[PDB]
Ligand binder design. Structure first.
Ligand SMILES: CCCCCCCCCCCCCCCCCC(=O)OC[C@H](COP(=O)([O-])OCC(O)COP(=O)([O-])OC[C@@H](COC(=O)CCCCCCCCCCCCCCCCC)OC(=O)CCCCCCCCCCCCCCCCC)OC(=O)CCCCCCCCCCCCCCCCC
Ligand SMILES: CCCCCCCCCCCCCCCCCC(=O)OC[C@H](COP(=O)([O-])OCC(O)COP(=O)([O-])OC[C@@H](COC(=O)CCCCCCCCCCCCCCCCC)OC(=O)CCCCCCCCCCCCCCCCC)OC(=O)CCCCCCCCCCCCCCCCC
Ligand SMILES: CCCCCCCCCCCCCCCCCC(=O)OC[C@H](COP(=O)(O)OCCN)OC(=O)CCCCCCCCCCCCCCCCC
Ligand SMILES: CCCCCCCCCCCCCCCCCC(=O)OC[C@H](COP(=O)(O)OCCN)OC(=O)CCCCCCCCCCCCCCCCC
Ligand SMILES: CCCCCCCCCCCCCCCCCC(=O)OC[C@H](COP(=O)(O)OCCN)OC(=O)CCCCCCCCCCCCCCCCC
Ligand SMILES: CCCCCCCCCCCCCCCCCC(=O)OC[C@H](COP(=O)(O)OCCN)OC(=O)CCCCCCCCCCCCCCCCC
Ligand SMILES: CCCCCCCCCCCC(=O)OC[C@H](COP(=O)(O)OCC[N+](C)(C)C)OC(=O)CCCCCCCCCCC
Ligand SMILES: CCCCCCCCCCCC(=O)OC[C@H](COP(=O)(O)OCC[N+](C)(C)C)OC(=O)CCCCCCCCCCC
Lengths: 105, 78, 506, 49, 155, 80, 137, 183, 192
């Protein structure tokens, strides 16, 4: 059967495993209907777009708003400019806060 | 990457050839870009209005379904 | 066999000297190639084995007994069309030499048959877009094969633009499907037939509806058919519908799995609207090809009701109708290519300009055909009577079978409108019969020697000189008696359609 | 790194590139979004069991 | 300051007012360049360069080639800005709010020790898996060569 | 906004301007495919995009050839 | 692979474009300084075409058209050889045979346009010679 | 391959601006239920220098770590946490050995790799010294599976492709061993 | 439904030609001389120009013979293929096929032949050329590769049928047959 969901390196990509488990269930011979494979179909769609998981992130954002939880103390620290991934931020022992070199590798 | 090189030159000729319109389009562009950096939510509200008027599930609507389920899933624990 | 011989014809035609006899002889080489293709196809392909459905070329192409029926039909109708360009349609050198002025005519036709026969078999959205372009590109070239003609080139320009928008809609539906699922193979999409936006398959249908000339898109098809040469209109107004309607039937087969009603209402909205325009449109027309363009739209409207219903009786209704309608279409156009020899010649008023591309262009150029050739007039009468739906011709059984499929699925509103639309359209089929015969008895004894046929040279004055060539006459007679005498073998033919399966099985 | 997965600016702002039979249904038709919103709702509707 | 918006607003302004065919061909080049540049950054650098090589280098200079052949012959500021502003307000192509407001990541892994470019995989599949798609394409190209000559060549 | 068919105001009044709109329209389809394929890390979508770019080129060449012969057909006196 | 060094280059070249235009506009002497006879606008004599001195007022060959038109099919053939270049080893003999077949079908097009001599400009209008034939009575 | 992804650092900061990339940290360490391991601290060049000696010493654990991934059937990260620490400890064992037995031979080689684009073809003179030292003091050898012994690339006396520029410390150290050892 | 034994779901091109019956060569010959005749028959039916029979120029007859030379072979190729698939009479080929395979397994060689193609290339090649003869009337495509997806069970070549034991062929267990999937993944589970 034709290959679908081929990664950028020729191998199976992130969501190929889910799609293959769907094909095994649909083309199986011990199934009377397609009901048992209904959950596997959701997982393949979930693996690709994360729509249900993004929704869960929306409630946790919205629930903290209605409780007053401080975003900076519930969320995770982040850096927007790659030049400021300094050794002070990375936690190195004697690291400066001077910017790092992201010009040429 | 070619638009990085062309963008400075085309903008100069856009103002030289047609300054008056260029002010508005640049004026319009900056107004919304500022509203995104300062969270004026004017574009968010038009999005939240458009979803209501065309039947879409708005952010308020999604949260309401959470509260119905919130009360109902607590009510069984009574 | 088709592809391999096409390369030989491409190279050989570019070598030998430009002449009409060699161009006509190469057209008879293609007539062999199409015949050879049918013998090889029928040898390996059987209804009994293709019933399950067989994947080919890494599942890109899927073939079953429903598709296989149309490939043989397409090959047959392409033989009857090539007989026109390969032999004489009139025998008068002035009128006929148009068919032999182009050497790439047969090559482009052979290009299209590859495009037409592969379209029903497609099983991947990647190959759906490629194949639909191979068929679409071949039609534009054939429409512009007579590049000297102003109307022909103007039509190909109109055809290319409308088809380009049609192909973009088709391409956009497939992209949207790939966006939701990430899968290209149609069988893999069927696993998610309940999890995808079923209206994105409808956007695919809206692109295929443009290419078959369905209202509200009907406007361009009527214009195109009434401008191309009658030999060209004979091909481009029938062949695309043979291969696209088969594809539309399959796509609707998959669609009715989830049985979405909103999808059916929109298509019923287009079928209902098309019957109205297909019937009331042809009432006020003077050009015959414009008349057969409105006639074509109405029959496509009937054939969509069988497609839309999509049951076990819908396969029988579609399979039978698509066959009888092709033979009727070939028979009518073949006659119009012949009876141009009876046109009068001036020795004035209304300044009607006729060209060698459409020598027969107006309905009243069929006048007094009951006098000039009675036998061929009845053949045109029988053919038109089939389109009307008078039993026991082939046309009646098409409408009767379509009605069974339509009403069995609850399409009461559309069934009644099609029976109203059929009667409204009978008005303008009756006009063709009015022009053929009604003024016979006033013109019965007339002194006619100014006909085009009277400019033919006299050969010997002792031997019998037939007026019409041999091959074209045998085709007209054969298809006229098949239309007329289908009642004799109708039961066998219909029982031969019960076996054509599209995953019915058990 | 966490980054968004939104369509290109040209795909959703060009005066011509944004017009299409399916792109209007994504933008102006609720049919698709109401169907998918059911699956998101039923995630939290199944935590009771 | 996502400046890619301002390039299209200028582009959307000149598409409403173009009169001759010189400006019409300019809208083509002014649309590919944002398409190429927004593909170079973000999504795919390989298809940004394929677009330049195939669209600009091949199909764009054909337009200006025939415009010199075809011919060269022959609104109000309030309505335009009003239309452009109205066009500017609603730019959400999709209505899945969480899909447009919540960010995602992927996890890398070291299982792929044979790392090669995408164009390596595309050739790997196009010349093996979908060799029918590749062969039909050369067939579509073949028909065009015949198709161009029959349309245009005089004798 | 585009539900009032604004894009018709943005297409010029020459046959060549229609041809360009067809290319800009199809360009949107290919950009949509490249977008999905890269996010999914799927090269099959990139095979589709490569085909769309190649097929969209053949469509341009045929359309221009018809337009070119359409133009010379009027200017076909050539009795000098 | 980092490309922040490349980005600065493209930005600088973009800045270099504005400099080339404006350096002329700031270094040329004022029109009053030279001769004052007018600006480029009013001086329509100076702002005009060059026709070698005498004032005067495209039906190109179809061969030129077919040269440009046939460029497009032959370009898509060349650009679709790109995937085979970076995958020549891993497709092996199978992809090599397919590639050759992909080239043979296009070559049959090259044969077709070589036999018709489509690109030749030809001379149908002129270069005629005749035989002087006497018509004695 | 320099394709943009959603999983690591991209080409330019203009990619980050379009994607609105946030570089997110997670301060939370692992729970105490999972016994701790000392992560390997070597950088790119030392690992590529000692890669074939990690393969020679940790072959059983690497195979077993992978066989746990094959037979975990998709739950690989969670069900191979204990087998994944043996590999980390084994590899730390090799780098600690090279630092305490062949510190100068090891450093010379991966300074060459850091000098010659991390390519094995450019550092054969330093690499040959390191392999000879490791064999006598740890018994590890470099073997490339799948080919005869006589046809391994790193033993090729006259390679077709040679470095353009020489590493001074490699050429100086090599000829010294031509006196110390080639007696 | 006329069903027979499935000799080979994807018969190899060289095998299909070596299995032509004498009647298959007759069809190839008839197709070769039929196409030039069909041109003559049309002229007898109707002259191309004028009103009297005129033999077509010899150049047309040479190109006609070539076109009918491939068409005859294609008809011959498809008819020979039906026997392998079991759609046609294949008792004569079944014994001929069994003799070659039982001999092949005996020498410990693979029945399918050694292949330059790696595991993925072998399986990919099979997908393209399997059931490709159904569209052999449209465009050609042949199985010219020594792959292993032929839709048979090699166990069925061990049992002795009528008139076979006299061959006295010794068949080793498949695990020791060179170039088979059951005899290659002995060192690593992903490399043959
Ligand atoms: C070889 C010469 C040949 O086959 O035909 C002679 C043929 C006759 O040349 P001519 O003297 O000008 O013909 C005058 C006659 O009036 C032309 O009419 P003709 O009837 O004498 O010949 C035309 C020819 C039809 O010509 C072809 O079909 C050639 C097809 C090749 C493409 O029809 C035949 O004669 C049939 C017999 C030969 C056909 C070969 C079919 C098997 C394919 C090999 O010459 C060619 O057609 C040359 C085509 C070959 C081009 C080069 C292809 C190279 C491909 C491989 C390169 C990479 C590996
Ligand atoms: C609109 C779209 C159009 C699409 C269609 C466009 C045209 C495409 C269709 C053209 C064909 C498509 C397939 C091409 C892609 C596949 C290429 C491929 O698989 O490469 C792998 C394949 C290597 O696979 P392998 O595992 O080493 O198999 C070895 C032999 O191929 C096989 O070993 P063997 O056990 O079969 O026997 C070896 C010995 C035969 O040994 C015997 O048993 C003696 C048989 C007596 C002679 C039989 C009569 C000879 C023919 C008459 O030599 C042969 O005769 C092998 C058959 C090849 C002869 C020519 C075939 C022409 C077919 C066309 O490469 C080749 O060796 C192919 C050689 C043939 C060249 C390609 C033919 C077309 C040119
Ligand atoms: C000329 C007509 C040639 C008819 C050949 C039809 C044929 O051979 O196939 C019939 C086909 C059944 O074939 P199938 O069920 O797949 O299995 C058997 C295959 N060996 O049955 C089919 O389904 C084919 C469907 C199309 C049938 C069209 C009906 C034929 C019309 C006859 C036209 C006659 C015109 C006069 C010819 C004049 C010649 C000078
Ligand atoms: C490095 C910079 C290169 C560009 C320098 C020119 C910049 C000026 C702004 C034009 C480019 C903006 C992009 C939108 C195209 C608009 C084209 C147009 O409408 O005409 C512009 C130009 C001047 O005419 P104008 O007075 O503005 O309009 C009424 C004239 N009857 O009418 C003309 O045709 C005059 C000649 C202009 C030819 C420009 C060719 C098209 C542009 C291609 C190069 C730039 C690519 C696009 C990059 C920016 C994309 C937003
Ligand atoms: C060998 C390949 C080319 C065939 C040429 C040989 C041939 O058949 O000659 C053509 C034949 C008689 O030749 P003819 O023209 O009468 O003698 C010269 C007079 N000036 O004239 C004829 O009547 C045509 C007879 C055709 C014979 C079969 C040709 C088969 C061509 C090979 C096909 C496969 C390649
Ligand atoms: C057609 C010629 C067929 C004869 C031929 O040379 O191909 C057979 C050849 C087999 O070589 P061999 O080493 O014996 O493969 C088995 C190894 N286990 O196969 C090969 O190894 C290479 C085949 C290349 C021949 C293709 C050249 C034809 C042009 C391609 C289009
Ligand atoms: C780099 C090139 C180096 C050599 C050329 C320099 C000559 C240009 C100097 C110049 O323009 O100086 C003269 C000028 C103004 O006098 P102007 O004659 O009207 O200037 C002509 C150019 N305007 C009118 C566009 C400005 O004075 C200054 O603005 C003094 C500071
Ligand atoms: C196994 C049975 C095979 C039967 C023969 C089939 C091939 C026909 C060629 C015969 C020779 C020939 O063409 O002879 C010539 C005759 C007569 O021609 P005419 O009109 O008098 O021309 C004038 C003749 N002069 C020059 C002497 C004046 O043509 C025919 O009668 C053609 C009959 C029509 C073809 C029948 C085919 C039916 C197809 C049915 C399947 C769908």
């Amino acid at each position: 059967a034709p290959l679908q969901q081929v990664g950028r390196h020729g191998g199976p990509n992130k969501c190929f495993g889910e799609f293959q488990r769907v094909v095994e269930c649909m083309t199986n011979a011990k199934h009377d209907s397609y009901e048992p494979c209904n959950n596997l179909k959701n997982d393949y769609l979930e693996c690709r777009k994360h729509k249900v998981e993004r929704y869960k992130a929306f409630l946790m954002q919205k629930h903290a708003e209605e409780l007053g939880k401080d975003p900076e103390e519930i969320g995770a620290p982040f850096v927007r400019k790659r030049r400021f991934l300094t050794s002070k931020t990375l936690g190195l022992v004697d690291g400066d806060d001077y910017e790092i070199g992201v010009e040429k590798i | 990457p070619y638009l990085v090189a062309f963008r400075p030159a085309v903008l100069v000729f856009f103002f030289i050839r047609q300054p008056i319109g260029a002010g508005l389009l640049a004026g319009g562009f900056l107004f919304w870009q500022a509203d995104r950096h300062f969270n004026f939510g004017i574009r968010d509200n038009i999005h939240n209005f458009k979803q209501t008027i065309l039947g879409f599930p708005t952010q308020a609507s999604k949260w309401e379904t959470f509260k119905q389920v919130d009360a109902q899933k607590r009510a069984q624990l009574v | 066999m088709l592809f391999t011989s096409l390369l030989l014809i491409i190279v050989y035609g570019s070598l030998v000297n430009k002449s009409h006899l060699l161009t006509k002889l190469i057209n008879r080489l293609g007539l062999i190639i199409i015949i050879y293709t049918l013998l090889i196809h029928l040898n390996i392909n059987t209804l009994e084995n293709l019933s399950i459905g067989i994947n080919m070329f890494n599942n890109l192409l899927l073939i079953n007994s429903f598709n296989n029926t149309i490939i043989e039909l397409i090959l047959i109708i392409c033989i009857l069309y090539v007989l026109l360009i390969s032999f004489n349609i009139t025998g008068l050198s002035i009128i006929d030499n148009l068919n032999y002025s182009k050497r790439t005519f047969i090559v482009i036709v052979l290009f299209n048959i590859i495009g037409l026969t592969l379209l029903p078999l497609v099983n991947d959205i990647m190959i759906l877009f490629i194949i639909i372009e191979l068929q679409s590109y071949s039609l534009y070239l054939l429409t512009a094969i007579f590049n000297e003609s102003h109307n022909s080139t103007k039509s190909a320009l109109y055809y290319f633009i409308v088809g380009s928008i049609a192909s973009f809609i088709i391409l956009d539906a497939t992209v949207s499907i790939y966006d939701d699922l990430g899968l290209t193979n149609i069988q893999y999409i069927l696993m998610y037939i309940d999890k995808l936006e079923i209206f994105d398959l409808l956007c695919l249908l809206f692109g295929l509806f443009i290419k078959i000339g369905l209202a509200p898109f009907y406007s361009y098809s009527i214009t195109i058919y009434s401008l191309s040469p009658t030999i060209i209109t004979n091909y481009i107004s029938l062949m695309p519908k043979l291969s696209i309607l088969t594809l539309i039937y399959i796509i609707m087969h998959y669609i009715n799995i989830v049985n979405n009603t909103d999808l059916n209402y929109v298509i019923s909205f287009l079928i209902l609207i098309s019957m109205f325009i297909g019937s009331f449109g042809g009432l006020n027309v003077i050009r015959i090809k414009t008349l057969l363009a409105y006639s074509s739209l109405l029959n496509v409207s009937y054939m969509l009701l069988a497609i839309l219903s999509n049951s076990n009786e819908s396969i029988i209704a579609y399979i039978y109708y698509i066959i009888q309608y092709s033979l009727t279409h070939i028979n009518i156009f073949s006659i119009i290519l012949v009876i141009s020899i009876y046109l009068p010649i001036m020795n004035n008023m209304l300044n009607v300009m006729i060209t060698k591309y459409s020598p027969i262009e107006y309905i009243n150029q069929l006048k007094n055909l009951f006098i000039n050739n009675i036998f061929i007039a009845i053949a045109l009468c029988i053919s038109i009577f089939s389109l009307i739906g008078i039993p026991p011709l082939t046309g009646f059984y098409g409408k009767y079978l379509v009605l069974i499929s339509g009403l069995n699925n609850g399409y009461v509103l559309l069934s009644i409108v099609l029976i109203i639309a059929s009667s409204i359209s009978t008005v303008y089929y009756a006009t063709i019969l009015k022009v053929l015969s009604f003024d016979t008895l006033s013109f019965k004894d007339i002194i006619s020697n100014n006909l085009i046929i009277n400019t033919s040279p006299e050969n010997n004055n002792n031997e019998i000189k037939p007026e019409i060539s041999n091959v074209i006459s045998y085709v007209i007679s054969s298809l006229t008696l098949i239309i007329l005498l289908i009642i004799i073998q109708y039961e066998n033919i219909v029982k031969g359609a019960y076996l054509v399966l599209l995953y019915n099985w058990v | 790194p966490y980054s968004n997965t939104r369509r290109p600016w040209v795909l959703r702002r060009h005066i011509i590139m944004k017009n299409s039979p399916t792109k209007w249904a994504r933008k102006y038709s609720s049919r698709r979004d109401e169907r998918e919103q059911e699956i998101k709702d039923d995630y939290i509707r199944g935590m009771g069991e | 300051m996502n400046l890619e918006i301002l390039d299209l607003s200028i582009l959307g302004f000149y598409s409403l007012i173009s009169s001759n065919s010189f400006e019409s061909i300019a809208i083509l080049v002014a649309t590919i360049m944002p398409v190429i540049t927004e593909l170079w950054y973000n999504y795919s650098q390989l298809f940004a360069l394929l677009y330049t090589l195939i669209y600009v280098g091949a199909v764009v200079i054909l337009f200006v080639f025939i415009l010199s052949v075809i011919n060269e012959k022959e609104s109000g500021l309030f309505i335009l800005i009003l239309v452009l502003l109205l066009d500017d307000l609603d730019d959400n192509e999709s209505n899945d709010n969480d899909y447009n407001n919540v960010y995602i990541t992927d996890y890398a892994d070291w299982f792929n020790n044979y790392n090669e470019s995408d164009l390596s995989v595309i050739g790997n599949l196009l010349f093996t898996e979908y060799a029918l798609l590749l062969l039909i394409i050369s067939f579509i190209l073949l028909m065009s060569i015949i198709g161009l000559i029959l349309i245009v060549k005089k004798d | 906004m585009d539900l009032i068919l604004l894009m018709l105001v943005a297409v010029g009044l020459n046959i060549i301007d229609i041809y360009i709109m067809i290319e800009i329209l199809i360009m949107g389809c290919t950009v949509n495919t490249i977008y999905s394929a890269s996010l999914d890390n799927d090269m099959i979508g990139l095979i589709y995009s490569l085909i769309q770019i190649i097929i969209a080129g053949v469509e341009s060449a045929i359309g221009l050839s018809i337009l070119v012969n359409y133009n010379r057909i009027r200017n076909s006196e050539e009795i000098e | 692979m980092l490309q922040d060094l490349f980005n600065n280059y493209v930005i600088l070249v973009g800045i270099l474009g504005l400099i080339f235009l404006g350096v002329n506009y700031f270094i040329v002497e004022s029109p009053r300084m030279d001769e004052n006879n007018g600006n480029i606008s009013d001086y329509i004599e100076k702002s005009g075409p060059f026709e070698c001195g005498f004032s005067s007022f495209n039906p190109i060959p179809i061969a030129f058209i077919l040269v440009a038109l046939l460029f497009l099919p032959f370009d898509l053939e060349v650009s679709s050889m790109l995937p085979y270049i970076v995958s020549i080893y891993s497709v092996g003999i199978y992809g090599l045979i397919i590639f050759i077949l992909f080239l043979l079908i296009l070559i049959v097009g090259f044969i077709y346009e070589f036999n018709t001599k489509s690109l030749s400009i030809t001379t149908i209008l002129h270069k005629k010679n005749k035989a002087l034939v006497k018509n004695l009575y | 391959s320099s394709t943009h992804t959603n999983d690591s650092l991209n080409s330019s900061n203009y990619v980050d601006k379009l994607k609105d990339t946030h570089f997110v940290f997670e301060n939370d360490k692992l729970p105490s239920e999972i016994p701790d391991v000392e992560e390997v601290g070597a950088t790119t060049a030392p690992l590529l220098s000692a890669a074939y000696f990690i393969g020679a010493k940790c072959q059983d654990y690497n195979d077993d770590f992978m066989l746990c991934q094959k037979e975990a059937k998709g739950n690989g990260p969670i069900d191979c946490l204990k087998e994944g620490r043996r590999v980390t400890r084994c590899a730390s064992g090799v780098l600690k050995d090279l630092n305490t037995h062949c510190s100068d031979e090891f450093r010379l080689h991966w300074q060459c790799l850091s000098f010659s684009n991390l390519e094995y073809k450019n550092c054969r003179k330093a690499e040959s010294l390191l392999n000879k030292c490791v064999f006598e003091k740890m018994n590890l050898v470099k073997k490339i599976p799948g080919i005869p012994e006589d046809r391994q690339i790193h033993l090729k006396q006259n390679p077709v492709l040679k470095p353009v520029a020489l590493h001074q410390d490699s050429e100086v150290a090599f000829k010294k061993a031509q006196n110390e050892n080639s007696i | 439904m006329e069903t027979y034994e499935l000799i080979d779901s994807d018969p190899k091109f060289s095998r299909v030609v070596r299995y032509f019956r004498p009647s298959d060569y007759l069809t190839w010959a008839l197709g070769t001389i039929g196409a030039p005749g069909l041109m003559v028959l049309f002229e007898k039916i109707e002259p191309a120009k004028g009103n009297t029979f005129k033999m077509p120029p010899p150049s047309i007859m040479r190109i006609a013979t070539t076109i009918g030379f491939f068409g005859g072979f294609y008809y011959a190729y498809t008819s020979s293929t039906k026997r392998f698939w079991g759609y046609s009479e294949n008792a004569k080929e079944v014994a001929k096929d069994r003799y070659e395979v039982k001999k092949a397994l005996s020498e410990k060689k693979s029945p399918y032949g050694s292949s330059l193609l790696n595991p993925y290339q072998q399986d990919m090649s099979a997908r393209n050329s399997t059931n490709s003869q159904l569209l052999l009337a449209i465009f050609p495509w042949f199985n010219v590769a020594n792959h292993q997806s032929h839709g048979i069970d090699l166990r069925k070549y061990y049992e002795v049928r009528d008139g076979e034991e006299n061959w006295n062929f010794t068949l080793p267990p498949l695990d020791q047959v060179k170039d088979l999937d059951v005899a290659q993944y002995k060192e690593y589970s992903n490399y043959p």
